[PDB]
Protein backbone atom coordinates (compact mmCIF):
# COMPACT_ATOMS: atom_id res chain seq x y z
CA UNK A 1 0.00 0.00 0.00
CA UNK A 2 2.19 2.90 -1.19
CA UNK A 3 1.43 6.29 0.37
CA UNK A 4 1.79 9.97 -0.55
CA UNK A 5 3.44 11.78 2.38
CA UNK A 6 4.29 15.20 0.94
CA UNK A 7 3.84 18.62 2.53
CA UNK A 8 1.58 21.04 0.70
CA UNK A 9 4.21 23.77 0.35
CA UNK A 10 5.81 22.38 -2.83
CA UNK A 11 2.49 22.16 -4.71
CA UNK A 12 3.65 25.18 -6.72
CA UNK A 13 5.86 24.29 -9.69
CA UNK A 14 7.12 25.70 -12.99
CA UNK A 15 6.08 22.59 -14.95
CA UNK A 16 2.72 21.49 -13.45
CA UNK A 17 -0.15 23.80 -12.57
CA UNK A 18 -2.01 23.65 -9.26
CA UNK A 19 -4.89 21.73 -10.85
CA UNK A 20 -2.49 19.36 -12.60
CA UNK A 21 -0.49 18.83 -9.40
CA UNK A 22 -3.60 18.12 -7.33
CA UNK A 23 -4.94 15.74 -10.00
CA UNK A 24 -1.57 13.96 -10.13
CA UNK A 25 -1.56 13.56 -6.35
CA UNK A 26 -5.14 12.26 -6.28
CA UNK A 27 -4.53 9.78 -9.10
CA UNK A 28 -1.28 8.64 -7.47
CA UNK A 29 -3.07 8.02 -4.16
CA UNK A 30 -5.25 5.35 -5.84
CA UNK A 31 -3.34 2.40 -7.26
CA UNK A 32 -3.96 -0.71 -9.35
CA UNK A 33 -2.13 -4.03 -9.28
CA UNK A 34 -1.97 -5.99 -12.53
CA UNK A 35 -1.50 -9.75 -12.94
CA UNK A 36 -0.04 -10.83 -16.29
CA UNK A 37 0.14 -14.52 -17.22
CA UNK A 38 3.67 -14.41 -18.58
CA UNK A 39 5.65 -17.53 -19.46
CA UNK A 40 9.19 -18.84 -19.10
CA UNK A 41 11.69 -21.28 -20.55
CA UNK A 42 14.16 -22.11 -17.78
CA UNK A 43 17.02 -24.58 -17.85
CA UNK A 44 20.71 -24.88 -18.70
CA UNK A 45 20.96 -24.01 -22.41
CA UNK A 46 24.30 -25.76 -22.88
CA UNK A 47 24.53 -24.76 -26.56
CA UNK A 48 23.08 -22.10 -28.87
CA UNK A 49 23.17 -23.27 -32.49
CA UNK A 50 21.94 -20.86 -35.17
CA UNK A 51 21.51 -22.61 -38.51
CA UNK A 52 20.99 -20.79 -41.80
CA UNK A 53 17.56 -19.74 -43.07
CA UNK A 54 16.91 -22.85 -45.15
CA UNK A 55 13.98 -22.54 -47.55
CA UNK A 56 12.22 -25.69 -46.34
CA UNK A 57 12.63 -24.77 -42.69
CA UNK A 58 13.21 -21.06 -42.16
CA UNK A 59 15.28 -21.60 -38.99
CA UNK A 60 16.96 -24.80 -37.77
CA UNK A 61 18.37 -23.07 -34.69
CA UNK A 62 19.24 -25.66 -32.05
CA UNK A 63 19.50 -24.68 -28.38
CA UNK A 64 19.52 -27.22 -25.55
CA UNK A 65 17.60 -25.79 -22.60
CA UNK A 66 17.44 -28.29 -19.74
CA UNK A 67 16.83 -27.87 -16.01
CA UNK A 68 18.05 -30.16 -13.24
CA UNK A 69 14.90 -32.26 -13.69
CA UNK A 70 15.19 -33.15 -17.39
CA UNK A 71 17.37 -32.98 -20.50
CA UNK A 72 15.76 -31.26 -23.49
CA UNK A 73 16.48 -29.41 -26.74
CA UNK A 74 14.55 -26.57 -28.42
CA UNK A 75 14.43 -24.52 -31.63
CA UNK A 76 14.64 -20.81 -32.44
CA UNK A 77 12.09 -19.20 -34.74
CA UNK A 78 14.38 -16.72 -36.56
CA UNK A 79 13.45 -14.00 -34.05
CA UNK A 80 15.17 -14.88 -30.75
CA UNK A 81 18.78 -15.19 -31.95
CA UNK A 82 19.52 -11.56 -31.11
CA UNK A 83 17.24 -11.83 -28.07
CA UNK A 84 19.89 -13.91 -26.31
CA UNK A 85 22.71 -11.53 -27.28
CA UNK A 86 21.15 -8.08 -27.12
CA UNK A 87 23.91 -7.76 -24.56
CA UNK A 88 26.83 -10.03 -25.41
CA UNK A 89 26.26 -13.21 -23.39
CA UNK A 90 27.13 -16.86 -23.95
CA UNK A 91 25.13 -20.09 -23.75
CA UNK A 92 24.37 -21.92 -20.52
CA UNK A 93 22.47 -18.85 -19.33
CA UNK A 94 19.17 -19.29 -17.50
Amino acid sequence: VPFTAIAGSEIFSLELSKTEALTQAFRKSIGIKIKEETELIEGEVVEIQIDRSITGGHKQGKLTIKTTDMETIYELGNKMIDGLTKEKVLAGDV
Binding site: S17, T19, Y74, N78, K79, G83
Partner: protein, 439 residues
Amino acid sequence: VTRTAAHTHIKGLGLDESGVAKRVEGGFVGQIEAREACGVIVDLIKAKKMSGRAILLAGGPSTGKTALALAISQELGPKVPFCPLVGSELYSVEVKKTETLMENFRRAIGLRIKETKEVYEEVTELTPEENPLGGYGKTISHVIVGLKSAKGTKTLRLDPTIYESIQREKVSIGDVIYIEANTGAVKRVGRSDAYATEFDLETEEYVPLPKGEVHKKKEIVQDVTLHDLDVANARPQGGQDVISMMGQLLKPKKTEITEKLRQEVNKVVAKYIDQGVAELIPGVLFIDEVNMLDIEIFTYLNKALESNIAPVVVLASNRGMTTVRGTEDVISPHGVPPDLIDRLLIVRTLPYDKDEIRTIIERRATVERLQVESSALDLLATMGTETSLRYALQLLAPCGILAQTSNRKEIVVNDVNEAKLLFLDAKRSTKILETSANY
Protein backbone atom coordinates in the same frame (compact mmCIF):
# COMPACT_ATOMS: atom_id res chain seq x y z
CA VAL B 1 -14.65 -4.71 -3.73
CA THR B 2 -16.98 -1.70 -3.79
CA ARG B 3 -16.60 2.01 -3.04
CA THR B 4 -19.54 4.35 -2.42
CA ALA B 5 -18.56 7.99 -1.86
CA ALA B 6 -21.51 10.20 -0.87
CA HIS B 7 -23.29 8.91 -3.98
CA THR B 8 -24.31 5.72 -5.85
CA HIS B 9 -27.40 5.96 -3.62
CA ILE B 10 -29.04 8.15 -6.29
CA LYS B 11 -30.34 6.86 -9.62
CA GLY B 12 -32.91 9.42 -10.80
CA LEU B 13 -35.30 12.26 -10.00
CA GLY B 14 -38.26 9.87 -9.82
CA LEU B 15 -40.98 11.77 -11.68
CA ASP B 16 -43.85 10.98 -14.05
CA GLU B 17 -45.50 12.53 -17.10
CA SER B 18 -47.77 14.66 -14.88
CA GLY B 19 -44.84 16.14 -12.94
CA VAL B 20 -45.70 14.03 -9.89
CA ALA B 21 -42.72 13.27 -7.66
CA LYS B 22 -42.17 10.42 -5.20
CA ARG B 23 -41.36 11.09 -1.55
CA VAL B 24 -38.72 8.32 -1.35
CA GLU B 25 -37.42 7.25 -4.76
CA GLY B 26 -34.18 7.42 -6.73
CA GLY B 27 -32.16 8.48 -3.71
CA PHE B 28 -34.09 11.76 -3.47
CA VAL B 29 -36.44 12.60 -0.60
CA GLY B 30 -38.39 15.86 -0.48
CA GLN B 31 -37.74 18.94 -2.68
CA ILE B 32 -41.01 18.90 -4.62
CA GLU B 33 -40.34 22.27 -6.27
CA ALA B 34 -36.72 21.51 -7.15
CA ARG B 35 -37.60 18.10 -8.60
CA GLU B 36 -40.46 19.60 -10.63
CA ALA B 37 -38.18 22.32 -12.02
CA CYS B 38 -35.41 19.83 -12.82
CA GLY B 39 -37.87 17.54 -14.59
CA VAL B 40 -39.23 20.42 -16.66
CA ILE B 41 -35.70 21.53 -17.56
CA VAL B 42 -34.56 18.03 -18.55
CA ASP B 43 -37.74 17.55 -20.60
CA LEU B 44 -36.90 20.77 -22.44
CA ILE B 45 -33.32 19.53 -22.89
CA LYS B 46 -34.33 16.16 -24.37
CA ALA B 47 -36.12 17.90 -27.26
CA LYS B 48 -32.83 19.43 -28.54
CA LYS B 49 -35.01 22.43 -29.40
CA MET B 50 -32.91 25.24 -27.89
CA SER B 51 -29.43 26.41 -26.90
CA GLY B 52 -27.88 28.66 -24.27
CA ARG B 53 -30.42 28.23 -21.48
CA ALA B 54 -29.24 29.10 -17.98
CA ILE B 55 -30.45 28.99 -14.38
CA LEU B 56 -29.11 29.90 -10.94
CA LEU B 57 -30.02 28.00 -7.78
CA ALA B 58 -29.53 29.29 -4.23
CA GLY B 59 -28.45 26.33 -2.12
CA GLY B 60 -26.29 26.12 0.98
CA PRO B 61 -23.68 23.44 1.61
CA SER B 62 -25.14 19.92 1.95
CA THR B 63 -28.51 21.16 0.65
CA GLY B 64 -28.27 18.85 -2.37
CA LYS B 65 -26.95 20.77 -5.37
CA THR B 66 -24.34 18.16 -6.35
CA ALA B 67 -26.90 15.38 -5.90
CA LEU B 68 -29.29 17.19 -8.24
CA ALA B 69 -26.48 17.72 -10.76
CA LEU B 70 -25.55 14.02 -10.77
CA ALA B 71 -29.20 12.99 -11.05
CA ILE B 72 -29.81 15.33 -14.00
CA SER B 73 -26.61 14.08 -15.65
CA GLN B 74 -27.92 10.52 -15.33
CA GLU B 75 -31.36 11.57 -16.64
CA LEU B 76 -30.03 12.20 -20.15
CA GLY B 77 -28.12 8.91 -20.24
CA PRO B 78 -24.41 8.15 -20.63
CA LYS B 79 -24.39 9.13 -24.31
CA VAL B 80 -25.47 12.75 -23.79
CA PRO B 81 -22.25 14.70 -23.12
CA PHE B 82 -21.54 16.39 -19.80
CA CYS B 83 -18.50 18.14 -18.30
CA PRO B 84 -19.12 19.57 -14.81
CA LEU B 85 -15.73 20.83 -13.66
CA VAL B 86 -14.62 22.88 -10.67
CA GLY B 87 -14.85 26.66 -10.86
CA SER B 88 -11.20 26.99 -9.83
CA GLU B 89 -10.05 25.01 -12.89
CA LEU B 90 -10.77 27.96 -15.19
CA TYR B 91 -7.61 29.78 -14.05
CA SER B 92 -5.22 27.72 -16.17
CA VAL B 93 -1.57 28.37 -17.12
CA GLU B 94 -0.88 27.56 -20.79
CA VAL B 95 -4.11 29.04 -22.22
CA LYS B 96 -6.26 32.06 -21.41
CA LYS B 97 -9.29 31.02 -19.38
CA THR B 98 -11.85 32.53 -21.77
CA GLU B 99 -10.34 30.31 -24.47
CA THR B 100 -10.76 27.38 -22.06
CA LEU B 101 -14.42 28.31 -21.57
CA MET B 102 -14.87 28.35 -25.35
CA GLU B 103 -13.14 24.95 -25.47
CA ASN B 104 -15.58 23.57 -22.90
CA PHE B 105 -18.55 24.92 -24.87
CA ARG B 106 -17.07 23.21 -27.94
CA ARG B 107 -16.70 19.95 -25.99
CA ALA B 108 -20.23 20.02 -24.57
CA ILE B 109 -22.13 19.93 -27.87
CA GLY B 110 -22.46 16.36 -29.11
CA LEU B 111 -22.86 14.47 -32.37
CA ARG B 112 -23.16 10.94 -33.75
CA ILE B 113 -21.18 10.00 -36.87
CA LYS B 114 -20.92 6.70 -38.75
CA GLU B 115 -18.98 5.01 -41.53
CA THR B 116 -19.28 1.77 -43.49
CA LYS B 117 -16.01 0.05 -44.39
CA GLU B 118 -14.84 -3.11 -46.13
CA VAL B 119 -11.71 -5.17 -45.51
CA TYR B 120 -9.98 -8.26 -46.92
CA GLU B 121 -7.86 -10.85 -45.14
CA GLU B 122 -3.87 -15.67 -44.57
CA VAL B 123 -2.51 -15.57 -48.13
CA THR B 124 -3.35 -18.51 -50.39
CA GLU B 125 -0.81 -17.99 -53.19
CA LEU B 126 1.19 -15.20 -54.82
CA THR B 127 1.91 -14.27 -58.45
CA PRO B 128 3.69 -10.97 -59.16
CA GLU B 129 4.33 -9.52 -62.60
CA GLU B 130 2.25 -3.04 -67.11
CA ASN B 131 4.55 -1.54 -69.70
CA PRO B 132 6.71 1.58 -69.43
CA LEU B 133 5.41 2.46 -72.93
CA GLY B 134 8.38 4.82 -73.21
CA GLY B 135 11.78 5.58 -71.72
CA TYR B 136 10.88 4.35 -68.24
CA GLY B 137 12.58 1.26 -66.86
CA LYS B 138 9.38 -0.73 -66.30
CA THR B 139 5.86 -0.44 -64.86
CA ILE B 140 4.71 -2.76 -62.06
CA SER B 141 1.03 -2.14 -61.33
CA HIS B 142 -0.63 -5.50 -60.56
CA VAL B 143 0.14 -8.53 -58.39
CA ILE B 144 -2.23 -11.41 -57.58
CA VAL B 145 -2.17 -11.90 -53.80
CA GLY B 146 -3.87 -14.74 -51.98
CA LEU B 147 -6.49 -14.23 -49.27
CA LYS B 148 -7.16 -17.33 -47.16
CA SER B 149 -9.42 -16.26 -44.28
CA ALA B 150 -11.60 -19.09 -42.94
CA LYS B 151 -14.93 -19.19 -44.81
CA GLY B 152 -13.68 -19.21 -48.37
CA THR B 153 -10.63 -17.90 -50.22
CA LYS B 154 -10.84 -15.04 -52.74
CA THR B 155 -7.50 -13.90 -54.15
CA LEU B 156 -7.54 -10.54 -55.91
CA ARG B 157 -5.22 -7.91 -57.35
CA LEU B 158 -5.63 -4.16 -56.85
CA ASP B 159 -3.56 -0.99 -57.32
CA PRO B 160 0.18 -1.59 -56.79
CA THR B 161 0.01 0.56 -53.65
CA ILE B 162 -1.61 -2.45 -51.98
CA TYR B 163 1.42 -4.48 -53.12
CA GLU B 164 3.88 -2.07 -51.51
CA SER B 165 1.59 -2.21 -48.48
CA ILE B 166 2.14 -5.98 -48.49
CA GLN B 167 5.90 -5.47 -48.40
CA ARG B 168 5.41 -2.80 -45.72
CA GLU B 169 3.61 -5.32 -43.51
CA LYS B 170 6.50 -7.73 -44.26
CA VAL B 171 4.01 -10.61 -44.39
CA SER B 172 5.07 -14.02 -45.67
CA ILE B 173 2.94 -16.38 -47.76
CA GLY B 174 1.56 -17.93 -44.57
CA ASP B 175 0.78 -14.58 -42.94
CA VAL B 176 -2.67 -13.09 -42.35
CA ILE B 177 -3.42 -9.43 -43.06
CA TYR B 178 -6.41 -7.11 -42.55
CA ILE B 179 -6.52 -4.68 -45.46
CA GLU B 180 -9.26 -2.05 -45.38
CA ALA B 181 -9.80 -1.25 -49.06
CA ASN B 182 -10.74 2.36 -48.26
CA THR B 183 -7.02 3.23 -48.07
CA GLY B 184 -5.24 0.24 -49.62
CA ALA B 185 -2.88 -0.03 -46.63
CA VAL B 186 -2.33 -2.97 -44.27
CA LYS B 187 -3.51 -3.62 -40.72
CA ARG B 188 -1.69 -6.63 -39.30
CA VAL B 189 -3.62 -9.36 -37.52
CA GLY B 190 -0.30 -11.18 -37.12
CA ARG B 191 1.14 -14.45 -38.35
CA SER B 192 -0.95 -17.53 -39.17
CA ASP B 193 -1.57 -20.90 -37.52
CA ALA B 194 -1.53 -23.04 -40.68
CA TYR B 195 2.02 -22.40 -41.94
CA ALA B 196 3.05 -22.03 -38.27
CA THR B 197 5.06 -24.39 -36.00
CA GLU B 198 8.09 -23.98 -38.26
CA PHE B 199 10.08 -23.78 -35.01
CA ASP B 200 9.69 -24.75 -31.36
CA LEU B 201 9.80 -21.07 -30.30
CA GLU B 202 8.42 -17.83 -31.73
CA THR B 203 8.37 -14.44 -30.03
CA GLU B 204 6.00 -13.23 -32.76
CA GLU B 205 2.45 -14.29 -31.94
CA TYR B 206 1.05 -17.17 -33.98
CA VAL B 207 -2.33 -15.34 -33.90
CA PRO B 208 -5.68 -17.13 -34.40
CA LEU B 209 -6.67 -17.79 -37.99
CA PRO B 210 -9.16 -15.14 -39.18
CA LYS B 211 -12.79 -16.17 -38.82
CA GLY B 212 -15.38 -15.63 -41.56
CA GLU B 213 -15.44 -14.82 -45.24
CA VAL B 214 -12.54 -12.78 -46.58
CA HIS B 215 -14.56 -9.95 -48.18
CA LYS B 216 -15.59 -8.61 -44.79
CA LYS B 217 -17.93 -5.61 -44.65
CA LYS B 218 -19.21 -3.70 -41.62
CA GLU B 219 -20.52 -0.38 -40.35
CA ILE B 220 -19.42 1.60 -37.28
CA VAL B 221 -21.31 4.28 -35.34
CA GLN B 222 -19.30 6.56 -33.04
CA ASP B 223 -20.42 9.55 -30.95
CA VAL B 224 -17.54 12.05 -31.01
CA THR B 225 -17.55 15.73 -30.08
CA LEU B 226 -15.83 18.47 -32.09
CA HIS B 227 -12.91 19.38 -29.82
CA ASP B 228 -11.39 15.93 -30.38
CA LEU B 229 -11.51 16.66 -34.12
CA ASP B 230 -9.87 20.05 -33.50
CA VAL B 231 -7.00 18.59 -31.47
CA ALA B 232 -6.55 15.76 -33.98
CA ASN B 233 -6.31 18.26 -36.84
CA ALA B 234 -3.92 20.47 -34.86
CA ARG B 235 -1.09 17.92 -34.71
CA PRO B 236 0.37 15.74 -37.48
CA GLN B 237 -0.59 12.07 -37.55
CA GLY B 238 1.94 10.47 -39.90
CA GLY B 239 5.32 11.25 -41.41
CA GLN B 240 8.48 9.23 -41.95
CA ASP B 241 11.36 11.70 -41.63
CA VAL B 242 12.84 13.56 -38.66
CA ILE B 243 10.07 16.16 -38.35
CA SER B 244 7.35 13.61 -37.54
CA MET B 245 9.29 11.69 -34.89
CA MET B 246 10.60 14.87 -33.27
CA GLY B 247 7.12 16.42 -33.19
CA GLN B 248 5.51 13.32 -31.71
CA LEU B 249 8.36 13.04 -29.19
CA LEU B 250 7.77 16.74 -28.49
CA LYS B 251 5.13 17.41 -25.85
CA PRO B 252 2.21 19.44 -27.24
CA LYS B 253 0.85 22.30 -25.15
CA LYS B 254 -2.64 23.73 -24.82
CA THR B 255 -3.15 26.60 -27.26
CA GLU B 256 -5.80 29.02 -28.55
CA ILE B 257 -8.36 27.70 -31.04
CA THR B 258 -8.86 30.04 -34.00
CA GLU B 259 -12.36 31.01 -35.13
CA LYS B 260 -11.55 30.17 -38.75
CA LEU B 261 -11.13 26.58 -37.58
CA ARG B 262 -14.57 26.90 -35.97
CA GLN B 263 -16.01 27.97 -39.33
CA GLU B 264 -14.21 25.11 -41.09
CA VAL B 265 -15.42 22.45 -38.65
CA ASN B 266 -18.98 23.81 -38.77
CA LYS B 267 -18.89 23.67 -42.57
CA VAL B 268 -17.58 20.11 -42.73
CA VAL B 269 -19.94 18.83 -40.03
CA ALA B 270 -22.87 20.43 -41.86
CA LYS B 271 -21.77 18.75 -45.09
CA TYR B 272 -21.53 15.38 -43.34
CA ILE B 273 -24.87 15.66 -41.51
CA ASP B 274 -26.60 16.69 -44.74
CA GLN B 275 -25.51 13.30 -46.13
CA GLY B 276 -27.09 11.49 -43.17
CA VAL B 277 -23.73 10.55 -41.66
CA ALA B 278 -24.19 12.33 -38.33
CA GLU B 279 -27.07 13.35 -36.08
CA LEU B 280 -27.10 16.31 -33.72
CA ILE B 281 -27.43 16.51 -29.93
CA PRO B 282 -26.76 19.54 -27.69
CA GLY B 283 -24.71 19.44 -24.49
CA VAL B 284 -25.00 20.21 -20.79
CA LEU B 285 -22.62 22.41 -18.79
CA PHE B 286 -22.31 22.75 -15.01
CA ILE B 287 -19.91 24.73 -12.82
CA ASP B 288 -19.76 24.61 -9.02
CA GLU B 289 -18.26 27.31 -6.80
CA VAL B 290 -19.01 30.05 -9.30
CA ASN B 291 -18.94 33.03 -6.92
CA MET B 292 -15.13 32.92 -6.84
CA LEU B 293 -15.03 33.93 -10.51
CA ASP B 294 -13.98 37.47 -11.39
CA ILE B 295 -16.06 40.30 -12.82
CA GLU B 296 -14.49 40.00 -16.27
CA ILE B 297 -15.85 36.46 -16.69
CA PHE B 298 -19.17 37.47 -15.09
CA THR B 299 -19.53 40.18 -17.77
CA TYR B 300 -18.09 38.25 -20.72
CA LEU B 301 -20.71 35.56 -20.08
CA ASN B 302 -23.30 38.29 -20.72
CA LYS B 303 -22.41 38.08 -24.41
CA ALA B 304 -21.24 34.44 -24.32
CA LEU B 305 -24.79 33.35 -23.45
CA GLU B 306 -25.80 34.84 -26.82
CA SER B 307 -23.70 32.27 -28.69
CA ASN B 308 -26.06 30.41 -31.01
CA ILE B 309 -24.45 26.98 -30.48
CA ALA B 310 -23.75 27.25 -26.73
CA PRO B 311 -25.59 24.41 -24.93
CA VAL B 312 -27.64 24.65 -21.74
CA VAL B 313 -25.57 25.71 -18.74
CA VAL B 314 -26.48 25.52 -15.05
CA LEU B 315 -25.17 28.14 -12.63
CA ALA B 316 -24.68 27.36 -8.93
CA SER B 317 -23.73 29.93 -6.27
CA ASN B 318 -24.18 29.25 -2.56
CA ARG B 319 -23.23 32.54 -0.87
CA GLY B 320 -25.35 35.66 -0.45
CA MET B 321 -24.68 39.41 -0.46
CA THR B 322 -21.05 39.07 -1.56
CA THR B 323 -18.84 41.04 -3.90
CA VAL B 324 -17.59 39.30 -7.03
CA ARG B 325 -13.99 38.17 -6.54
CA GLY B 326 -11.95 41.19 -7.62
CA THR B 327 -14.73 43.81 -7.37
CA GLU B 328 -14.33 46.92 -5.24
CA ASP B 329 -18.05 47.75 -5.12
CA VAL B 330 -19.88 45.18 -7.31
CA ILE B 331 -21.65 43.40 -4.45
CA SER B 332 -24.56 41.17 -5.40
CA PRO B 333 -26.59 38.25 -4.05
CA HIS B 334 -24.68 34.96 -4.44
CA GLY B 335 -21.74 36.90 -5.90
CA VAL B 336 -23.26 37.25 -9.38
CA PRO B 337 -23.76 40.74 -10.86
CA PRO B 338 -27.29 41.99 -11.66
CA ASP B 339 -26.48 42.57 -15.33
CA LEU B 340 -25.78 38.82 -15.50
CA ILE B 341 -28.83 37.69 -13.50
CA ASP B 342 -30.97 39.66 -15.95
CA ARG B 343 -30.42 36.70 -18.34
CA LEU B 344 -31.66 33.76 -16.21
CA LEU B 345 -33.95 32.84 -13.31
CA ILE B 346 -33.62 31.64 -9.72
CA VAL B 347 -34.41 28.37 -7.94
CA ARG B 348 -34.25 27.76 -4.18
CA THR B 349 -32.55 24.57 -2.94
CA LEU B 350 -33.31 24.32 0.79
CA PRO B 351 -31.99 21.98 3.52
CA TYR B 352 -33.68 18.88 4.80
CA ASP B 353 -35.94 17.90 7.69
CA LYS B 354 -36.21 15.43 10.58
CA ASP B 355 -37.77 12.35 8.98
CA GLU B 356 -35.99 13.30 5.78
CA ILE B 357 -32.59 13.31 7.48
CA ARG B 358 -33.21 10.07 9.37
CA THR B 359 -34.25 8.35 6.13
CA ILE B 360 -31.11 9.74 4.47
CA ILE B 361 -28.97 8.23 7.23
CA GLU B 362 -30.82 4.90 7.02
CA ARG B 363 -30.40 4.74 3.24
CA ARG B 364 -26.70 5.56 3.58
CA ALA B 365 -26.52 2.68 6.05
CA THR B 366 -28.16 0.46 3.43
CA VAL B 367 -25.76 1.46 0.65
CA GLU B 368 -22.90 0.95 3.13
CA ARG B 369 -24.44 -2.49 3.91
CA LEU B 370 -24.54 -1.84 7.65
CA GLN B 371 -27.41 -2.34 10.10
CA VAL B 372 -28.51 0.68 12.15
CA GLU B 373 -30.48 0.55 15.39
CA SER B 374 -33.38 2.90 16.08
CA SER B 375 -31.68 4.61 19.03
CA ALA B 376 -28.38 5.25 17.26
CA LEU B 377 -30.18 6.29 14.06
CA ASP B 378 -32.30 8.78 16.01
CA LEU B 379 -29.27 10.17 17.87
CA LEU B 380 -27.36 10.64 14.60
CA ALA B 381 -30.37 12.25 12.92
CA THR B 382 -31.09 14.56 15.86
CA MET B 383 -27.54 15.85 16.23
CA GLY B 384 -27.54 16.31 12.47
CA THR B 385 -30.69 18.41 12.79
CA GLU B 386 -29.06 20.65 15.39
CA THR B 387 -25.73 21.04 13.56
CA SER B 388 -25.12 18.97 10.41
CA LEU B 389 -26.07 15.78 8.57
CA ARG B 390 -22.55 15.36 7.19
CA TYR B 391 -21.28 14.73 10.72
CA ALA B 392 -23.52 11.68 11.03
CA LEU B 393 -22.65 10.64 7.47
CA GLN B 394 -18.93 10.66 8.27
CA LEU B 395 -19.56 8.95 11.62
CA LEU B 396 -21.53 6.06 10.09
CA ALA B 397 -18.50 4.26 8.66
CA PRO B 398 -16.18 4.59 11.71
CA CYS B 399 -19.10 3.49 13.89
CA GLY B 400 -19.37 0.42 11.68
CA ILE B 401 -15.63 -0.07 12.20
CA LEU B 402 -16.16 0.08 15.97
CA ALA B 403 -19.03 -2.41 15.71
CA GLN B 404 -16.89 -4.79 13.66
CA THR B 405 -14.07 -4.49 16.21
CA SER B 406 -16.76 -5.26 18.80
CA ASN B 407 -17.74 -8.29 16.66
CA ARG B 408 -21.27 -6.94 16.15
CA LYS B 409 -23.16 -5.85 13.04
CA GLU B 410 -25.11 -2.91 14.50
CA ILE B 411 -24.44 0.59 15.79
CA VAL B 412 -25.20 1.03 19.48
CA VAL B 413 -25.20 4.30 21.43
CA ASN B 414 -21.80 3.21 22.74
CA ASP B 415 -20.30 3.19 19.24
CA VAL B 416 -21.69 6.59 18.24
CA ASN B 417 -20.57 8.25 21.48
CA GLU B 418 -17.13 6.63 21.16
CA ALA B 419 -16.81 8.02 17.63
CA LYS B 420 -18.01 11.40 18.94
CA LEU B 421 -15.31 11.36 21.62
CA LEU B 422 -12.54 10.21 19.28
CA PHE B 423 -13.68 12.50 16.43
CA LEU B 424 -14.82 16.09 17.01
CA ASP B 425 -16.70 18.47 14.70
CA ALA B 426 -16.62 22.14 13.73
CA LYS B 427 -18.86 23.28 16.59
CA ARG B 428 -16.66 21.75 19.30
CA SER B 429 -13.69 23.48 17.66
CA THR B 430 -15.39 26.90 17.70
CA LYS B 431 -14.81 27.15 21.48
CA ILE B 432 -11.58 25.20 22.09
CA LEU B 433 -8.83 26.70 19.88
CA GLU B 434 -8.58 30.06 21.69
CA THR B 435 -7.01 28.52 24.82
CA SER B 436 -3.94 27.30 22.91
CA ALA B 437 -0.62 28.81 23.97
CA ASN B 438 1.08 27.07 21.04
CA TYR B 439 -0.55 27.99 17.73
